[PDB]
């Protein structure tokens, strides 16, 4: 299209706010190496691994473009503008572009690394719009578009897992060759583009309820309904069984008849940010909340949307019930608590049970007088969905994921991703990119053996993602001011969400969306 | 229409495959006796029965035509063609016909049975298209159209149950007279027909997932989210409480943050096909999984769709969690395991919990350091539906039921029949048929007593059922071949799904539909 | 079509010679019993038979109409007229008809055989025009239309053989249910008919 010396695209990184819409566009510079030396390799769990950690799959020589994080499209100022003024938002459509593709040939002679242009090499790009490949987006994987537009990122290697009986495979395991898909070949001067339309999805609840589910009544007027308030009365110098009933008002507000129930629960262990407050033992798995599937235990993380803590208990968080983001420069294994930023889901405690506490109590026997049996109750540590139940989904964050693919199953209930975001039956398709293998010098005699020597090469270029978002404008009638996200005025060595003296971009804290308030 | 000597129909038994449709037509020869001697009889549970077995109802002199089994429409070759090539199917419309109706009068004089034609007698046929009668189809009852087109079958007697307080009735119990419905009277030469259109229903998942719900990630790329990996560190020669966090990858794949959860569970007791492996006690009811309704325990069979067993445990099946079909010639009471064929639901263990195991673990207390309390967990033997839960329904079989009527209730969740099939708010109507009573010789003097003497007679004829099915064509992109149902090439005394030297048709094994694979 | 008492066909047994064509028509009276007591029975070679005589197959309750012999259509005078004057001949088209169908019910009480009409019973007739069944015609089997038009013949029982490993079967062996075909049901007064056109074939060398 543009041969050598003509640009095939421009840098478009910006956002436009027009009424009930905001269109965010981002451009980044990517680098794509050669993966697996142009080979597909069967991968599996190491021998000696536990049964829960056993897996089987395949590693492909392809890479994929991931922009399933809000920081890839929204600047921190854009996020503050979104969350301080809107009661909801949802994606509408997206546009994707690859351009200014350069293939570089790398040679190494006598310890010298020489890089030169390869104007005749191609890169293969295709979008899995029919969803025939395992969808690895939406698993909170690294390799996304960096939040800072000036950062250059490596394209992550694509790989998938299939059915496994231990470290081995079964007959139902599926193998996928990505070269069996039609792909577009791009030289220097060719560009790739495609457009996608999001399906209709609910607006994200970017608000916190200003009412509690157990405080929805009028405190001035008594109820006309009666509740059992007493079970005995003083008789002589002993007691005698006698049922009495009262109408509930403000003084006994806990006994009022109600129409709704708090959302479902799956209890998590409570851990404290203050280290001394925790038990002096290794309980990251023994005390962990797990689900059992085909004989293997998987960690429930973050699980059903539940409040991190109750009133005046901000130091407590569920063991695996909240998203934990790493600070800039954080390592991979066994980093301290000061190296991570733990999110808080306290805005949903109005309708959702606290993660570390029981849902409630139920009767377990039948009380009877004169032998006599006293009424007994048990804690409900796990509660399924009941009719009349209301709940709020997990909050989304600037560093958090945007969407996930709803699994193709016969049944599912409330297919909102548990990690947060929008559940899509047809999510944005995976975009697979790889360098076309260029064989090295062949033998002058024919050999039926497949080629194993190739010219070392990588590719670099620009990627553009433009997403149109629909806004749900706030229409509140509260009198007093609301909570808004704000920067702190006091002086500091570094400004938040900027670069330091090393030019390293950092995100100091996770920012949610639930700052405005709406009545229940 | 055709008086005596003119045929009122033809034999149409065949199937036509046209693109995304398959139309199966079946014809059978039926025999309808006189039931209850033309009387309606109140029936109830025997005195001395347990409370769980108490019932009250009515027995009617009518019969009904049942074709609610896949073998009534699909030949084994048709089933193999359906399940090896399609990712789903659902019924669209049906056509029903009764024709070539012959009424035979039976007399017995001096020990001799003489059968002669009765060309003036009728049979009453009507369809309950308004669903005003108790729907007894969909309870897995015998009396369907035989799988082999050459077999002649007796029309089952229609009967229903109503409310009962023990063996007695209550004021809310309903009585239905089927002669209070408009019915069509058919002599020899008359035919009956009606057409029905199925409501829109989901395609049956005739596939097995090639991915597990806990293995949906990219094994090559670490997650950016952190999880609590350690709770203490070596301090001096003792231990000290210290929280640490890690990013999950392939080595600790069980700790990865996930968006979905396995489907709901209702734990079943585990029994083994190897007899010695089972407990030497009577636990078919004490250890059974039950639901309590109005003071009576009912067996949960087969219950919510759950995997029969985990990897390498094919000898284990839930006690009442799978469909059990009888082999040819199997008796009714206490047949051995070799006389029955137990189905397997292992294809859904990718998303559904194993029936005999717990759903998972939840926290039951609050861990705390220095008294100190260690974190405690409990098994979740019963789990209701949670937001983000995905599951697969129970498989359908060639010998299994096709549909069931969704109960007319205010609320229901996922109204797929638990025995397998399609949930229909307006299922195919019940077709009721009975012989018109022909009074015997009356007295020359008037008597107000109702007639109690009738001419003994039965009817025979042909029944045709034609169902159009819609197909969901497989669109897989896997490289390696798939599992397909096949006959075994090795020599045998008898061919499968044929007749033996006695001409007795048998179905050697249950055939499901989940052979092709699709990604999650 | 003709209920009880109306004939559904006529007797047409004759031949017409017109130039380069001869049309032969034959009518016969057939009797069809109940075969296998309405059952399909798996059949196989007896144990102890030689390997050359081993077979496996199925016996069906159906019968079949066979007219694959020249005496079923040509009288001896017709044959003499054909062979003394023609250098060749070949079939062109055929027409088939079943009519005047009577179903008789047989009872046996105290050693007495009583036969009475059954005016409401049917007979199922279908032609395998798609050749989906094993073709047992052309194996020189008995049961054809008798050469003499006045003879009454029994309808032969249909049966087929499939793959066998000795007296047993293999996985490739095929089973066919003839009730899985669309068939026409005929009471007394109904008739069946169909027309067939022969493909182009060489003339038989009726010369020395």
XYZ file of C-alpha atoms in Angstrom, chain A:
520
model
C 0.000 0.000 0.000
C 2.810 2.421 0.945
C 5.881 0.436 -0.151
C 9.112 1.656 1.507
C 9.147 5.259 2.702
C 5.413 6.030 2.834
C 3.703 5.997 6.217
C 0.634 3.764 6.476
C -0.869 5.462 9.529
C -0.737 8.316 12.008
C -0.489 8.625 15.781
C -4.001 9.040 17.238
C -3.935 9.081 21.072
C -6.742 11.249 22.559
C -10.289 11.314 23.911
C -13.407 13.185 22.794
C -16.372 13.771 25.105
C -19.622 14.444 23.205
C -22.787 14.394 25.330
C -23.541 10.836 26.424
C -20.482 9.410 24.629
C -16.733 9.373 25.173
C -14.412 8.036 22.468
C -10.950 7.053 23.701
C -8.155 6.406 21.194
C -4.729 5.014 22.066
C -1.568 4.394 20.050
C 1.419 2.344 21.212
C 4.676 1.047 19.762
C 4.989 -2.742 19.915
C 7.826 -5.209 19.407
C 7.133 -8.765 18.238
C 9.943 -11.347 18.445
C 10.030 -14.827 16.953
C 8.350 -17.230 19.373
C 9.297 -20.904 19.797
C 11.569 -20.566 16.736
C 8.509 -20.762 14.450
C 7.355 -24.007 16.100
C 4.306 -25.336 17.931
C 5.428 -27.131 21.128
C 3.305 -29.366 23.322
C 3.476 -28.138 26.918
C 2.346 -29.755 30.153
C 2.774 -29.494 33.899
C 6.108 -30.608 35.316
C 6.360 -34.115 36.749
C 5.973 -34.030 40.539
C 3.469 -31.170 40.518
C 0.358 -31.425 42.653
C -2.894 -32.591 41.094
C -4.367 -29.088 41.384
C -1.474 -27.705 39.311
C -1.563 -30.333 36.545
C -2.254 -29.061 33.035
C -1.801 -29.885 29.359
C -1.756 -27.535 26.406
C 0.127 -26.162 23.433
C 2.452 -23.207 22.905
C 2.119 -21.412 19.583
C 4.660 -19.248 17.707
C 2.029 -16.493 17.476
C 1.544 -13.415 19.613
C -1.638 -11.563 20.476
C -2.620 -7.946 21.078
C -4.266 -7.391 24.469
C -6.029 -4.171 25.458
C -8.402 -5.643 28.063
C -7.519 -3.118 30.775
C -9.030 0.353 31.320
C -5.588 2.080 31.616
C -4.990 1.092 27.920
C -7.702 3.578 26.874
C -8.348 6.012 29.756
C -5.839 8.469 31.141
C -6.091 9.116 34.900
C -7.699 12.490 34.155
C -10.103 10.706 31.795
C -10.914 8.207 34.552
C -11.531 11.016 37.046
C -13.799 12.767 34.537
C -15.684 9.502 33.974
C -16.172 8.425 37.586
C -16.966 11.821 39.144
C -19.800 12.678 36.745
C -21.452 9.482 35.458
C -23.707 6.892 37.076
C -22.694 4.256 34.526
C -20.837 3.433 31.344
C -20.497 0.615 28.822
C -18.526 0.004 25.615
C -20.306 0.431 22.289
C -17.858 -0.202 19.430
C -14.128 -0.378 18.785
C -11.724 0.191 15.869
C -8.275 -1.485 15.654
C -5.310 -0.685 13.428
C -1.778 -2.004 12.814
C 0.491 0.209 10.732
C 4.066 1.361 10.120
C 5.218 -2.249 10.258
C 8.990 -2.736 10.125
C 10.661 -6.144 9.949
C 14.222 -6.107 11.287
C 16.743 -8.854 10.552
C 19.187 -9.601 13.382
C 22.587 -11.174 12.728
C 25.404 -12.061 15.122
C 28.919 -12.457 13.705
C 32.008 -12.738 15.935
C 30.119 -11.397 18.945
C 28.645 -8.368 17.149
C 24.886 -7.775 16.972
C 23.910 -6.092 13.694
C 20.320 -5.065 12.935
C 19.230 -4.211 9.395
C 15.913 -3.634 7.670
C 14.122 -6.442 5.835
C 11.778 -4.693 3.409
C 10.469 -7.919 1.828
C 9.490 -9.841 4.971
C 5.874 -10.024 6.121
C 3.888 -10.369 9.330
C 0.722 -12.475 9.459
C -2.271 -10.895 11.211
C -5.767 -12.301 11.632
C -8.679 -11.796 14.020
C -10.501 -14.798 15.500
C -13.955 -13.327 14.749
C -15.610 -16.756 14.738
C -14.189 -17.608 18.200
C -12.779 -20.935 17.009
C -9.639 -20.601 19.166
C -9.380 -20.845 22.964
C -10.088 -17.378 24.340
C -7.127 -16.517 26.574
C -8.092 -12.859 26.945
C -9.948 -12.083 30.143
C -7.638 -14.135 32.382
C -5.869 -11.011 33.741
C -2.651 -11.726 31.849
C 0.319 -9.406 31.460
C 1.332 -7.995 28.095
C -1.387 -5.385 27.563
C -0.946 -1.946 26.051
C 1.064 0.037 28.615
C -0.884 2.736 30.473
C 1.636 5.424 29.500
C 1.428 6.218 25.759
C 5.214 6.692 25.520
C 6.064 3.135 26.646
C 7.059 0.410 24.177
C 5.749 -3.078 24.926
C 6.478 -6.629 23.804
C 3.661 -8.652 22.234
C 2.809 -11.585 24.543
C 3.086 -15.137 23.253
C -0.187 -16.929 22.568
C -0.834 -20.279 24.221
C -3.801 -22.336 25.314
C -4.662 -25.254 27.574
C -6.849 -28.236 26.750
C -8.201 -31.274 28.648
C -5.609 -33.148 30.747
C -5.628 -36.345 32.844
C -2.682 -35.318 35.036
C 0.285 -34.231 32.917
C -1.037 -36.302 29.986
C -3.798 -35.626 27.473
C -7.064 -37.394 26.687
C -8.764 -38.217 23.409
C -11.029 -35.181 23.751
C -8.075 -32.769 23.922
C -8.055 -30.335 21.004
C -5.073 -29.112 18.995
C -5.238 -25.863 17.025
C -2.913 -24.754 14.235
C -3.189 -20.991 13.778
C -1.803 -21.225 10.232
C -5.032 -23.135 9.333
C -6.792 -19.744 9.578
C -6.854 -17.179 6.755
C -4.445 -14.406 7.715
C -3.399 -11.130 6.112
C 0.270 -10.775 5.153
C 1.735 -7.302 5.694
C 5.015 -5.992 4.322
C 6.511 -2.607 5.268
C 3.874 -0.236 3.883
C 0.826 -2.443 4.484
C -1.663 -1.844 7.285
C -4.325 -3.920 9.019
C -7.669 -2.752 10.372
C -10.975 -4.114 11.616
C -14.077 -2.811 13.377
C -16.088 -4.493 16.122
C -19.441 -3.675 17.720
C -20.075 -4.581 21.345
C -23.279 -6.411 22.165
C -25.840 -4.775 24.431
C -24.606 -5.000 28.029
C -25.777 -3.401 31.280
C -24.188 -0.146 32.360
C -21.522 -0.622 35.000
C -22.798 0.579 38.398
C -20.316 3.443 38.869
C -22.091 4.572 42.029
C -22.384 3.688 45.701
C -25.798 3.300 47.300
C -26.618 6.012 49.836
C -29.175 3.688 51.468
C -28.720 0.307 53.114
C -30.952 -2.627 52.209
C -31.999 -3.009 55.894
C -32.781 0.735 56.253
C -35.283 1.308 53.429
C -38.257 2.135 55.665
C -39.819 5.323 57.020
C -38.448 5.739 60.578
C -41.390 7.939 61.618
C -44.275 5.530 60.908
C -44.809 2.123 62.482
C -45.568 -0.924 60.369
C -49.039 -2.434 60.381
C -47.527 -5.934 60.323
C -46.785 -7.799 63.547
C -43.765 -9.875 64.525
C -43.235 -12.316 67.381
C -41.519 -10.109 69.965
C -41.811 -12.207 73.130
C -41.982 -15.945 73.783
C -42.669 -15.997 77.542
C -44.014 -13.853 80.369
C -43.236 -13.681 84.123
C -45.563 -16.211 85.834
C -45.479 -16.393 89.654
C -41.763 -16.477 90.606
C -40.899 -18.594 87.509
C -41.647 -18.086 83.767
C -44.530 -19.272 81.582
C -44.611 -19.738 77.815
C -46.702 -17.035 76.136
C -46.467 -15.669 72.597
C -46.717 -11.905 72.097
C -46.533 -9.766 68.970
C -45.536 -6.162 68.321
C -45.576 -3.705 65.443
C -42.071 -2.714 64.386
C -40.976 0.928 64.404
C -37.719 2.818 64.795
C -36.791 1.485 68.248
C -36.955 -2.153 67.086
C -35.988 -1.356 63.491
C -34.164 -4.690 63.127
C -37.468 -6.613 63.341
C -39.251 -4.774 60.519
C -40.803 -6.852 57.755
C -38.846 -6.446 54.531
C -39.285 -7.314 50.864
C -35.672 -8.045 49.860
C -32.583 -9.979 50.944
C -28.829 -9.372 50.648
C -27.013 -10.998 47.755
C -25.351 -14.412 47.748
C -22.290 -15.232 49.811
C -19.272 -17.578 49.697
C -17.372 -16.954 52.908
C -13.708 -15.933 52.783
C -11.101 -16.027 55.528
C -10.308 -12.667 57.117
C -6.723 -11.373 56.994
C -5.422 -8.072 58.442
C -3.057 -5.553 56.811
C -1.415 -5.239 60.286
C 0.855 -8.347 60.266
C 0.879 -8.994 64.037
C -2.919 -9.380 63.941
C -2.685 -12.504 61.758
C -2.250 -16.084 62.922
C 1.365 -17.278 63.069
C 0.908 -20.160 60.643
C 0.845 -20.965 56.912
C -2.857 -20.792 56.009
C -2.798 -19.390 52.460
C -4.211 -22.709 51.196
C -5.557 -24.612 54.212
C -7.763 -21.656 55.157
C -8.375 -20.650 51.542
C -11.791 -20.616 49.890
C -11.835 -23.215 47.121
C -14.085 -24.891 44.585
C -13.702 -28.556 43.645
C -13.783 -29.511 39.955
C -12.832 -32.932 38.544
C -10.838 -33.792 41.657
C -8.772 -30.584 41.636
C -9.105 -27.652 44.069
C -8.956 -24.182 42.521
C -8.639 -20.976 44.513
C -11.788 -18.839 44.550
C -10.283 -15.487 43.581
C -11.871 -12.978 43.791
C -15.133 -14.945 43.766
C -18.643 -13.559 44.204
C -18.882 -9.820 44.771
C -18.898 -9.204 48.526
C -17.991 -6.331 50.818
C -14.359 -6.349 51.920
C -15.191 -5.285 55.480
C -17.888 -3.814 57.699
C -17.887 -0.387 59.364
C -14.602 0.730 60.948
C -12.697 -2.385 59.860
C -10.741 -1.066 56.876
C -7.646 -3.039 57.922
C -9.451 -6.333 57.203
C -9.785 -7.811 53.724
C -10.832 -11.241 52.437
C -7.966 -13.647 51.877
C -8.740 -14.117 48.167
C -11.823 -11.925 47.801
C -10.358 -8.691 46.395
C -8.227 -7.735 43.424
C -4.600 -7.081 44.360
C -2.559 -4.913 41.995
C 1.215 -4.658 42.074
C 3.000 -1.367 42.542
C 5.601 -0.274 40.011
C 8.694 -2.462 40.146
C 6.987 -5.220 42.176
C 8.431 -8.733 41.763
C 6.468 -11.894 41.002
C 6.875 -14.174 44.038
C 6.271 -13.433 47.727
C 6.313 -9.642 47.663
C 5.468 -7.824 50.879
C 2.146 -6.124 51.561
C 3.731 -2.688 51.069
C 4.608 -3.753 47.504
C 0.956 -4.345 46.536
C -2.222 -2.257 46.501
C -5.284 -4.078 47.843
C -8.634 -2.923 46.488
C -11.694 -2.257 48.645
C -15.303 -3.229 47.883
C -16.893 -1.402 50.813
C -19.285 0.617 48.625
C -21.422 -2.503 48.077
C -21.894 -3.397 51.755
C -25.313 -1.729 51.550
C -26.688 -4.724 49.610
C -23.937 -7.366 49.673
C -22.857 -9.414 52.696
C -19.406 -8.908 54.154
C -17.027 -11.432 52.610
C -15.508 -12.623 55.889
C -18.793 -12.996 57.799
C -21.769 -15.320 57.594
C -24.787 -14.523 55.448
C -27.112 -15.041 58.409
C -28.710 -17.650 60.631
C -31.298 -20.370 60.049
C -33.157 -22.700 62.377
C -31.827 -26.244 62.694
C -34.398 -27.980 64.925
C -37.974 -27.725 66.218
C -38.405 -26.051 69.597
C -40.947 -27.669 71.906
C -42.044 -27.378 75.539
C -42.728 -30.110 78.096
C -38.700 -33.305 77.080
C -38.242 -29.668 76.118
C -36.002 -28.632 73.220
C -34.686 -25.087 72.885
C -34.513 -23.374 69.509
C -31.148 -23.746 67.776
C -29.563 -21.744 64.962
C -26.587 -22.192 62.655
C -24.446 -19.790 60.666
C -24.935 -19.780 56.893
C -21.374 -19.574 55.578
C -22.517 -20.231 51.992
C -25.787 -18.928 50.548
C -27.089 -19.525 47.047
C -29.376 -17.174 45.179
C -32.858 -16.854 46.695
C -35.947 -15.180 45.209
C -36.060 -11.526 46.193
C -32.241 -11.262 46.465
C -30.532 -8.016 45.299
C -26.792 -7.434 44.954
C -24.148 -5.257 43.317
C -21.432 -6.546 41.013
C -17.712 -6.123 41.603
C -16.282 -2.688 40.872
C -14.046 -2.013 37.880
C -10.715 -0.231 38.235
C -8.398 1.779 36.015
C -5.850 -1.054 36.187
C -8.607 -3.674 36.093
C -9.979 -5.741 33.222
C -12.737 -4.438 30.971
C -14.482 -7.565 29.684
C -14.450 -11.349 29.600
C -15.915 -14.015 27.346
C -18.956 -15.787 28.766
C -18.261 -19.543 28.511
C -20.302 -21.375 25.880
C -22.446 -23.406 28.267
C -26.095 -24.504 28.414
C -26.727 -22.473 31.559
C -25.236 -19.571 33.467
C -26.567 -17.160 36.079
C -25.716 -13.442 35.964
C -22.726 -13.729 33.573
C -20.860 -10.723 34.928
C -17.153 -11.616 35.233
C -16.135 -12.225 38.830
C -12.896 -10.269 38.362
C -14.989 -7.264 37.300
C -16.189 -5.926 33.983
C -18.665 -6.701 31.206
C -19.700 -10.233 30.309
C -19.763 -10.665 26.529
C -21.036 -13.684 24.619
C -19.087 -12.352 21.609
C -16.221 -10.324 23.103
C -13.669 -8.397 21.029
C -11.916 -11.062 18.955
C -8.364 -12.151 19.628
C -5.888 -10.496 17.260
C -3.049 -12.890 16.429
C 0.215 -11.649 14.911
C 3.440 -13.459 14.058
C 6.506 -13.011 11.883
C 6.567 -15.067 8.707
C 9.496 -17.517 8.921
C 12.225 -16.701 6.400
C 14.379 -19.787 5.697
C 18.146 -19.399 5.823
C 20.491 -20.683 3.117
C 19.232 -24.087 1.897
C 21.331 -27.040 0.768
C 21.925 -27.391 -2.975
C 20.802 -31.029 -2.643
C 17.146 -31.762 -1.959
C 16.280 -32.778 1.600
C 12.815 -33.894 2.689
C 13.495 -32.815 6.280
C 11.539 -29.743 7.322
C 13.491 -26.480 7.545
C 15.162 -25.901 10.909
C 17.431 -22.932 10.064
C 15.874 -19.482 9.699
C 16.996 -15.875 9.522
C 16.670 -14.311 12.965
C 14.219 -11.430 12.814
C 11.644 -9.448 14.762
C 9.068 -6.799 13.922
C 8.079 -3.423 15.331
C 5.192 -1.118 14.579
C 2.311 0.932 15.905
C -1.064 -0.236 17.203
C -4.199 1.909 17.537
C -7.289 1.083 19.611
C -10.324 3.383 19.542
C -13.323 2.556 21.742
C -16.613 4.453 21.904
C -18.240 4.367 25.346
C -21.818 5.266 26.247
C -22.385 7.290 29.414
C -25.278 7.199 31.879
C -25.485 10.770 33.145
C -26.021 11.320 36.860
C -29.476 12.705 37.704
C -29.244 12.988 41.481
C -31.360 15.359 43.639
C -29.267 15.184 46.826
C -28.602 18.512 48.515
C -25.203 18.173 50.179
C -22.013 17.636 48.085
C -20.915 14.080 47.035
C -17.617 12.178 47.412
C -15.388 12.788 44.377
C -11.991 11.417 43.449
C -9.357 14.134 43.738
C -5.608 14.631 43.769
C -4.071 15.612 47.124
C -3.107 19.326 47.258
C -0.223 18.890 49.702
C 3.295 19.081 48.253
C 5.092 15.885 47.357
C 8.350 14.745 45.799
C 6.484 13.169 42.868
C 3.150 13.954 41.245
C 0.678 11.073 41.147
C 0.241 9.226 37.836
C 3.332 10.839 36.302
C 6.926 9.814 35.638
C 9.729 10.081 38.180
C 13.302 11.351 37.654
C 13.943 7.980 35.895
C 10.954 8.659 33.582
C 9.268 5.530 35.044
C 5.463 5.785 34.933
C 3.675 4.534 38.036
C 0.073 4.244 39.207
C 0.132 5.054 42.941
C -3.253 3.569 43.894
C -6.202 1.723 42.351
C -9.097 3.983 41.394
C -12.590 2.523 41.323
C -15.687 4.097 39.836
C -18.147 4.273 42.754
C -18.031 7.856 44.022
C -21.431 9.297 43.128
C -24.446 8.075 45.080
C -27.918 6.880 44.089
C -30.868 5.757 46.279
C -31.759 2.072 46.449
